[PDB]
Amino acid sequence: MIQGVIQKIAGPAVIAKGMLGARMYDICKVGEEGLVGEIIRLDGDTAFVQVYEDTSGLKVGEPVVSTGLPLAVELGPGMLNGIYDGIQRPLERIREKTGIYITRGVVVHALDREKKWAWTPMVKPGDEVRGGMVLGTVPEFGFTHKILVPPDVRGRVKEVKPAGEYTVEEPVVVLEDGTELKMYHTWPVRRARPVQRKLDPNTPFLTGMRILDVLFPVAMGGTAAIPGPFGSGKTVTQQSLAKWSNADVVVYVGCGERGNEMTDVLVEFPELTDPKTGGPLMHRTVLIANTSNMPVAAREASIYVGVTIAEYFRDQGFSVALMADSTSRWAEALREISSRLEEMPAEEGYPPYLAARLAAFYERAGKVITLGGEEGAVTIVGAVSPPGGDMSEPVTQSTLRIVGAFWRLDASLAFRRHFPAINWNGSYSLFTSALDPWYRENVAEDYPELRDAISELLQREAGLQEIVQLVGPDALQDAERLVIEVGRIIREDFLQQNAYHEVDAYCSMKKAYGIMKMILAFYKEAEAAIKRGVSIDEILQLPVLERIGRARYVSEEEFPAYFEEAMKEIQGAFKAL
Amino acid sequence: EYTGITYISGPLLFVENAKDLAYGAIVDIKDGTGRVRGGQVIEVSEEYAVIQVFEETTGLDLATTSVSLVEDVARLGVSKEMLGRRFNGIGKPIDGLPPITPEKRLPITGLPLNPVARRKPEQFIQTGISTIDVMNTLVRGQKLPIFSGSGLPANEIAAQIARQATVRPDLSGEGEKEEPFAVVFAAMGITQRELSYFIQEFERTGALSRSVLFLNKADDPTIERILTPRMALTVAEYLAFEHDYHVLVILTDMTNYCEALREIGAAREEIPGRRGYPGYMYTDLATIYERAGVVEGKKGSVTQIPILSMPDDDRTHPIPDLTGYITEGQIQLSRELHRKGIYPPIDPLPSLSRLMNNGVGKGKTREDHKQVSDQLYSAYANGVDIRKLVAIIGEDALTENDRRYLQFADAFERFFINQGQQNRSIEESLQIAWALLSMLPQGELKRISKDHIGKYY
Amino acid sequence: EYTGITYISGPLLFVENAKDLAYGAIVDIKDGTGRVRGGQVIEVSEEYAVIQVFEETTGLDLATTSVSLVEDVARLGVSKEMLGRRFNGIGKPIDGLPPITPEKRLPITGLPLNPVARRKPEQFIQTGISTIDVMNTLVRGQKLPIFSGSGLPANEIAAQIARQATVRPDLSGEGEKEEPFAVVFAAMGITQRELSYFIQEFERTGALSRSVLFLNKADDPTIERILTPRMALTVAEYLAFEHDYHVLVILTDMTNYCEALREIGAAREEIPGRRGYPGYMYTDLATIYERAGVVEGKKGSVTQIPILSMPDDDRTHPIPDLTGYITEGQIQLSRELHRKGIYPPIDPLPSLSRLMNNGVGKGKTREDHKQVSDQLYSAYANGVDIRKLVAIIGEDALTENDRRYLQFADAFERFFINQGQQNRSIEESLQIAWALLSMLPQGELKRISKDHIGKYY
């Protein structure tokens, strides 16, 4: 449509006139080189354009051809098991057109449209569609993906192809009432699908890590954070999360990630194995991750993209598992862009518009019931990565109230090879309160009763180890001994796990529940031991302790039979003495 | 009417000339992308008047635009069936059920309150979380900020006192037709956690028969956060003074107020940094905490009960600092006792209760209410004090005139502070307070003398 | 001409008729002094441009303002004859060989590495040292910053390790012919002594016919500062990926790099950043470091080691923060160590390299290495706790274990950390570790298995 001419070139931002009556957000070809750009805030007959890539010899006054229609996010088949970036372009079609090192003026599509994707229909000619529920599905080998037509798109459908593999670009359907579609659908980048009711999580939390989910439930549609810098033992959580955790889909996303560490992940991604899918995790994982070896505005465009696509899955009754890594670092870009503008940094060294888009990011993500009446969950794990650990930086002291849980791992807790390494005095989840109803309701009746109660172990052990059992526990009271007797089972059973052994790292409700349970029934018998004056030599040598240990080396299969024998064994080993 | 725009921007923008644009007028703008917005016309020029953009910059064009004046200033209805109903959202309230008829359409800017049209308090609020309303003396003649702080929840505490405020004919000062079960809540900005928490709380408290809770819904645009406070307010000012009823504006976290507010101050180039958060803060807040007094020549009030958290467990940040100054004193909760299990944790160690003998008396509540006010305070205070100087010189420093003050802090601890969410009358509180004032020898006490000793044991 | 000269204050210049000019261009300016000077053309418009003169600003006159167009496109040679030369600055004759060799006129920034074309570390390098190759393996394409102080000579401790460094992938089954030792060095803002002390090391023993210098003197203009890296950057791509060679980029003094940058950006209308250092740093700093990491099918890739200065290694300004997100690990310098003349000075618990076992395995750097690498971390760190406390704990309590841990330390800093300018390999740097631990009993060895002990003690 429109055609304009450049006026200023202020580094990567550009200012160009000839663009009037424009539509905000465009694919845009800046110059004849074809630097990928976006028309943003106009003023008069000229505008501010934020051009993702750099210049190196672009003249002033050249022709600028641009779409003149709003850029929307494109969604269709090839989204699952396709490599993408936060600009909504596929990273693999880039590599193929740029080689080893990115070149300027190379642009690609927005979907995997060169591939002929499987199809089977779910509507038939002369029937009307209902938006926000269904259209027809793509059976992908990797993971099932229901390509549905967005809400408020009503009216008859005509000519629906049967089974066969069909390109994205080729029709598989058409609409009778006009505004014929193919298999690709367009949704505005910052518009969110409306809902029928708000909902609250009640889907049990399991991430495959003991203390991680059993002490702190945050549930599906909670919002978490992992503070401190990423790497140096922190990777444990992130990796294992999407392997075990109850989500149907996984979304990974970067925005200023590391070098070699950001590639270790990609490469080991298909060799991470899901049990439902039974092979490659990459099958039900969508990639849109961005590193700083990608354009300026890469990291600034990042969020909204990923957010939208997650809502797609949500709509089909699929729970997603988003990981908004390097939140701190997102803003790098925003700041840079805003310097060059009137929207200058004015907070505490970062934008005051930082505050708006950080907040809103969490207010669009949860468990809810969509317009088609399907329920998904849009769980975020917040790797912020501040430079000290400080709270006087914007990013932290904002997240801190907005998102209700903080999951600090300590370096010491990590180094001994007992996972998770979660430092409890430095973690919290304000979610737990309102979930206590829904926990006991669906999971198990005495489940809450175990967690809250048992945590007192760590508290009277933290200030006990210090320098009060410096002289050995044998020179202390029999009530202060009791704490390390139970202490054995909590530290060799209910906190020891391996990311090297896959028969112990697979955990679920029923396994973790009995483990925490036994340590209640062993305190109830420990404390009856010291009330009878039973020696602390023979209680530390019971077969009972060993009976716990063999039942963390089976995933959940041998667990039921081992709980039959293991429980009653406690019962007759304090009664055998 | 004005066709054409010469600036597409997100918080404020150009509208050529002006000849009938009022200050703070309602305009309607068809963006030509099929969307429609409004806003206030704050700042009017014959050069470039700038209008309050109500949503993000996307979804704007110059192909079709129009600016058109709808009303002189902001206005909105106040039903007399507003009480006993929750009206979530603003403009068109989505409380998920139909809106109530705007019976009396009046302004929602604010109606000021003459300083000579005020009278000294005489009402008490009997609330079921004993500890506060005993010592601090919760009256309507104070507006003390409740500071939650980091890793202390703002919701749970606010949630509590919702159903737990009760009314008596004369154990509350004033009558029970002068105090309804109605209350009002005004959000300064609710967040993820704050909303996902109050969901369950509406169906349990009775937000359909005793509570009004205006919200921002946590997902409406930023400028909405500088609309809902004063809008929520004015509503209640009417049924309170003119219709006669006591209602308490139970605020929420002023952090998100700053948040939204700040972006206007860097897009108009004001003073948006006092120490990292606005220098112009207080100016807009003049109106919020102006009606938080007690009217003279009418009956029934409005009192702001600020409830606000802190970005750090230190106050070096403007967030609680500028609020301290504005308003009067502080009540806190801290995390001293929270780490051990106590709920509700209440620490009024650095507190200041401005009034505590006004708005109560003797016979307006109880006889020993006026006396046992300061007593508990310093009895308890000097408990925690000991644990300080013992450890300084070896591990003891205690005397026999210490062993009694020591245990006065245990006695005040889990017996009085901890209570669950169990409603407690002003009777049950003060009555039994005097048997916990039987841990130190009675008769000559610090603030009490022999006049309630032989009457209350 | 190219007149329109306004604000020539210092090395700024505005000129009209910049409709013939481009961003990313460089042009000859003419004047009647007879000086022909460059300077990049930034912030361009159809009228006013910003040019920043190559050398000074003394000579610009009003008579002649003409500009002989050199080239709008950015010209930059890709060289292949530069693998054993010497140059200072941009590329000027020191050894009397010509600046560069043309193949192409590639731009200065072509845009960094595509991430799906990057593979995992799977090889390692050896810098002739013990502690930073045994305890922490410097791997393939690793980005490892060396945080140095101020008042300490950064520069010497750098080039010291120059000659020591000769790679040893011997133990894996690869030569130093499939891993050549190519030192490509780009500093800026270096002292007159230090700039000659650098070339001294090289010319000593044979290592200058396999390496290229570039080093922009502290008296060579702040404009040339910036481009210095970008030059050899673009040449480097063509060295290690397309010749299959292995380069090691060693930058020094980042403070100068970042100061000069600021001046440039401040005229393009970009506001400087926290503690004055720029906020548009991030982007620009990325582009130098992200040409590091291995590449699929191309064995040779560049290893990045940047070196920067801080007052005491404090993290209270941008220079570390920024860096510390894209780069992995940090290796700070100890005052104790450097006093006593233990070189290079690497801290105990304060120091760690984020990757150290995913570029090496067992039998690639020896099998026992695995658990030896996490012994000497916990084993060294224990002596640092009584490395001054032997008369602060008096002679009224003294134990055998901790005493022996003082003697461990003295021999650990002498023999293990420092090893002079004498060369070492993996196998000789391993010897030292075992020997010292031999004083210590089996009962104080706990981080190494009996299997490894049954190999070497």
Curated annotation (Swiss-Prot), chain A:
Its EC number is 7.1.2.2. ATP binds at residues 228-235. InterPro entries: ATP-synt_VA_C, ATP-synth_a_Xtn, ATP_synth_asu-like_sf, ATPase_a/bsu_AS, ATPase_F1/V1/A1_a/bsu_N, ATPase_F1/V1/A1_a/bsu_N_sf, ATPase_F1/V1/A1_a/bsu_nucl-bd, ATPase_F1/V1_b/a_C. One of its GO terms (biological process) is proton motive force-driven plasma membrane ATP synthesis. It catalyses: ATP + H2O + 4 H(+)(in) = ADP + phosphate + 5 H(+)(out). The keyword Transcription regulation does not apply. One of its GO terms (molecular function) is ATP binding. Keywords: ATP synthesis, ATP-binding, Hydrogen ion transport, Ion transport, Nucleotide-binding, Translocase, Transport. It comes from the Bacteria. One of its GO terms (cellular component) is proton-transporting ATP synthase complex. Belongs to the ATPase alpha/beta chains family. Produces ATP from ADP in the presence of a proton gradient across the membrane. The V-type alpha chain is a catalytic subunit. This is V-type ATP synthase alpha chain. It comes from Thermus thermophilus (strain ATCC 27634 / DSM 579 / HB8). The gene is atpA.
From Swiss-Prot, chains B, C:
Belongs to the ATPase alpha/beta chains family. One of its GO terms (biological process) is proton motive force-driven plasma membrane ATP synthesis. HAMAP family: ATP_synth_B_arch. This is V-type ATP synthase beta chain. The lineage of its organism: Bacteria, Thermotogati, Deinococcota, Deinococci, Thermales. Keywords: ATP synthesis, Hydrogen ion transport, Ion transport, Transport. InterPro entries: ATP-synt_VA_C, ATPase_a/bsu_AS, ATPase_F1/V1/A1_a/bsu_N, ATPase_F1/V1/A1_a/bsu_nucl-bd, P-loop_NTPase, V-ATPase_su_B/beta. NCBIfam families: PRK04196.1. Produces ATP from ADP in the presence of a proton gradient across the membrane. The V-type beta chain is a regulatory subunit. Disulfide bonds: none annotated. GO terms for molecular function: ATP binding; proton-transporting ATP synthase activity, rotational mechanism. CDD domains: ATP-synt_V_A-type_beta_C (cd18112), ATP-synt_V_A-type_beta_N (cd18118), V_A-ATPase_B (cd01135).
